[PDB]
Structure 1
Amino acid sequence: GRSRLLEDFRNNRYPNLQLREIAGHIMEFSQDQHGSRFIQLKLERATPAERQLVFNEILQAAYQLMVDVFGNYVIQKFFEFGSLEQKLALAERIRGHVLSLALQMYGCRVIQKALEFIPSDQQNEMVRELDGHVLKCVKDQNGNHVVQKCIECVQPQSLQFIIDAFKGQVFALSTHPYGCRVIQRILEHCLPDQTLPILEELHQHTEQLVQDQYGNYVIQHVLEHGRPEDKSKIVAEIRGNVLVLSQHKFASNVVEKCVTHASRTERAVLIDEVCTMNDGPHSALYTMMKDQYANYVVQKMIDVAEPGQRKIVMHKIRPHIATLRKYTYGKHILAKLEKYY
């Protein structure tokens, strides 16, 4: 259903075709695979007035391009290099479609690009349309990215409805593929008063989360970027289980971060547990040093352990070298242990 001029363009019958020249066809070229690219590149080094000529032809049926496989690129360009006015107009064409577009394979982009470039006032307007639909968005393959961009670009006090939406859902969403990524954004960007009710629910389930394919990434984040009081809680839930969680494919990464981020005093108590403890008819460190996952925790322990504590652990391992040497899940520990012969 193309046009002569467009078929024409595809036949390379215009090696030097200009923007000014496809006027009255901006809409048709925007929904074409080559036409759209063409416009996209001509816009990148076009004059303001020229871009305006194109902008005019895409404004009215702007929503149609926003959800089009090829036109989602053209609208985006205007959000990146367009004038303030052009952006407020596009944002105006978005008003009332925010939700549908945030869940659309192509629209979600546009929404994300717009959230990154429009002023706070227009961002706050756009974000409201999502209130009451936050979970549906988080669980959507396209929507989770939008919810996510809001948190990164929009003022925190405008995202209060996001926090409320998570009320009694933190556990359910931490063990969700997209939900965990959103929660980590919240922990990184939302305010102190807002993050508190989220952390409260995580602590309540902290044990089940270190063992989840996703949950263990949320707890690791608290340890790497959270408040000491928060870290303290986690390490306290890990204590008494250092040995077993260290060998778990998922929780072992958390105990790793615990040994690395906890407080002095706590760090010494984690080393003391595995040191003053025994596994089978064999040493606790013996099991960890040759284990696929636990071996990293011992490495972490050797580094952060303090003089007195550190030799102890070296006196615990020294009797098992011959064995350690033949374990590739053991060439870094060993390596430590040699640094002081």
Structure 2
Amino acid sequence: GRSRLLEDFRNNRFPNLQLRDLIGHIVEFSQDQHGSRFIQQKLERATPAERQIVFNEILQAAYQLMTDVFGNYVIQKFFEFGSLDQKLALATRIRGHVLPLALQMYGCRVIQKALESISSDQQSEMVKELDGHVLKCVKDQNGNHVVQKCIECVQPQSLQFIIDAFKGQVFVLSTHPYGCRVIQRILEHCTAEQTLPILEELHQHTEQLVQDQYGNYVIQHVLEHGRPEDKSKIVSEIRGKVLALSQHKFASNVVEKCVTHASRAERALLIDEVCCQNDGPHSALYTMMKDQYANYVVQKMIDMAEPAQRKIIMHKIRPHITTLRKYTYGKHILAKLEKYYL
């Protein structure tokens, strides 16, 4: 049922088609896979007058387009390139519908782009509509991306209710595949007063988080980016357990990040731990090198070791060259030994 113009455009009739040529058909083009891309591209360099001509047509259909697989990109491009009065008009259409839009597969994209594009007060007015619905949004396939963008974009005073809603839920959310990403954003962007209670709760569950499919991601984040004191708390949960945890599908990630990112003394302590440990009739290092997960830990220990600790590891690794060649991943440590021994 396409218009002749949209059919002609799709058949490459018009290599010099312009926004002005679309009058009457703008909503139809916006809902088309190819027509939408055309409008998206043209909006970048359109004159304000050309943008207004398009906007006049789409405004009546704005909510429909926000929730359309292809039309949402056109609304995003008005947040990106539109005038302040166009963004005003769109924020108006969004008002009172931020929650359903945030939960909508395409509308969540529009709210995200709006947050990147609008004033601090406009942002505050949008995000408050999520009050009472924070955990629902955080776990939602679409809403979680809106909550993440709020944390990246919005003033901390206007975010506080999100932080408050996490109290008592940090463990549940950190072990959730979408929740764990929101927790990471909080750790990056929120103020120290906001992250303090989140971290305190995280440290109450470290043992379980390090072994969790998604929780280990949060623990890794604190190792890579957090304050020394928080890293030390995590190290306290790894010491005495390096051999066991290095062989764990998920906790091995955490062990590696301890070796790479913890303090100089902490890194040395964990390395020392496996250098002096025998795993029955085999070395702890022997056990670790044949393991699909722990081998990478050993790789990092070699990389991070001080010249003195490195001497010892390389010395204990050497008699197991033939064992290394059996494994697809033995490649890396072998190459390290070769480089190390001239």
Cα displacement string for residues 13-62 of structure 1 (whole angstroms, at most 9, x for unaligned residues): 76765433443443344334554444334434422112112212222332
Cα displacement string for residues 257-316 of structure 1 (whole angstroms, at most 9, x for unaligned residues): 101111111112111211221112211111112221111111221222223322222332
- Counterpart of 2:206? 206
Inter-CA distance 244–34: structure 2 relative to 1 (3 Å threshold): closer
The CA distance in 2 between the partners of 1:152 and 1:270, in whole Å, is 35
2:24 corresponds to 1:15: no
Does the aligned pair in 1 maintain the 2:19–2:50 contact within 8 Å? yes
- Report the Cα offset of residue 115 of structure 1: 0.8
User: Unaligned stretches of 5+ in structure 1?
Assistant: none
The CA distance in 2 between the partners of 1:6 and 1:68, in whole Å, is 18
Cα displacement string for residues 134-175 of structure 1 (whole angstroms, at most 9, x for unaligned residues): 111111111111111111122223211111111111111111
How do 1:268-279 residues align onto structure 2 when only pairs under 5 Å count? 268-279=268-279
Q: What is the TM-score when the length of structure 1 is the normalising length?
A: 0.92
Secondary structure class of the residue paired with 1:61:
helix
Does the aligned pair in 1 maintain the 2:156–2:190 contact within 8 Å? yes
- Report the Cα offset of residue 5 of structure 1: 6.1
Cα displacement string for residues 312-335 of structure 1 (whole angstroms, at most 9, x for unaligned residues): 223322333333344343233233
Does the aligned pair in 2 maintain the 1:102–1:146 contact within 8 Å? yes
- Report the Cα offset of residue 83 of structure 1: 1.2
The CA distance in 1 between the partners of 2:317 and 2:62, in whole Å, is 68
Secondary structure class of the residue paired with 1:286:
helix
- Report the Cα offset of residue 6 of structure 1: 5.7
Comparing 215-224 and 266-275, the one that deviates more = 266-275
Comparing 205-214 and 1-10, the one that deviates more = 1-10
Inter-CA distance 12–235: structure 2 relative to 1 (3 Å threshold): closer
Does the aligned pair in 2 maintain the 1:138–1:144 contact within 8 Å? yes
Does the aligned pair in 2 maintain the 1:289–1:329 contact within 8 Å? no
User: Unaligned stretches of 5+ in structure 2?
Assistant: none
Inter-CA distance 307–89: structure 2 relative to 1 (3 Å threshold): same
Inter-CA distance 310–91: structure 2 relative to 1 (3 Å threshold): same
Comparing 300-309 and 155-164, the one that deviates more = 300-309
Comparing 80-89 and 52-61, the one that deviates more = 52-61
Inter-CA distance 297–31: structure 2 relative to 1 (3 Å threshold): closer
The CA distance in 2 between the partners of 1:202 and 1:79, in whole Å, is 37
RMSD over aligned CA atoms reads 2.2
Inter-CA distance 13–279: structure 2 relative to 1 (3 Å threshold): closer
Cα displacement string for residues 153-212 of structure 1 (whole angstroms, at most 9, x for unaligned residues): 222232111111111111111111101111111111111111111111111111111111
- Report the Cα offset of residue 336 of structure 1: 2.8
- Report the Cα offset of residue 12 of structure 1: 6.9
- Report the Cα offset of residue 8 of structure 1: 7.1
Inter-CA distance 272–56: structure 2 relative to 1 (3 Å threshold): same
The CA distance in 2 between the partners of 1:73 and 1:43, in whole Å, is 11
The CA distance in 1 between the partners of 2:316 and 2:101, in whole Å, is 60
Comparing 221-230 and 331-340, the one that deviates more = 331-340
Comparing 251-260 and 68-77, the one that deviates more = 68-77
- Counterpart of 1:80? 80
Secondary structure class of the residue paired with 1:24:
coil
Percent identity between the two aligned chains: 91
The CA distance in 1 between the partners of 2:282 and 2:137, in whole Å, is 51
Inter-CA distance 276–126: structure 2 relative to 1 (3 Å threshold): same
Inter-CA distance 276–94: structure 2 relative to 1 (3 Å threshold): same
- Report the Cα offset of residue 113 of structure 1: 0.9
Does the aligned pair in 2 maintain the 1:18–1:42 contact within 8 Å? yes
Inter-CA distance 60–247: structure 2 relative to 1 (3 Å threshold): same
Comparing 259-268 and 39-48, the one that deviates more = 39-48
Inter-CA distance 21–281: structure 2 relative to 1 (3 Å threshold): closer
Comparing 89-98 and 45-54, the one that deviates more = 45-54
Inter-CA distance 89–327: structure 2 relative to 1 (3 Å threshold): same
- Report the Cα offset of residue 110 of structure 1: 0.9
Does the aligned pair in 2 maintain the 1:103–1:142 contact within 8 Å? yes
Comparing 325-334 and 197-206, the one that deviates more = 325-334
Does the aligned pair in 2 maintain the 1:259–1:304 contact within 8 Å? yes
Does the aligned pair in 2 maintain the 1:291–1:329 contact within 8 Å? no
Q: What is the TM-score when the length of structure 2 is the normalising length?
A: 0.91
Inter-CA distance 231–57: structure 2 relative to 1 (3 Å threshold): same
The CA distance in 2 between the partners of 1:177 and 1:244, in whole Å, is 25
Secondary structure class of the residue paired with 1:337:
helix
Does the aligned pair in 1 maintain the 2:43–2:81 contact within 8 Å? no
Paired residues, number? 341
The CA distance in 2 between the partners of 1:40 and 1:339, in whole Å, is 53
Comparing 131-140 and 306-315, the one that deviates more = 306-315
The CA distance in 1 between the partners of 2:303 and 2:63, in whole Å, is 57
- Counterpart of 1:163? 163
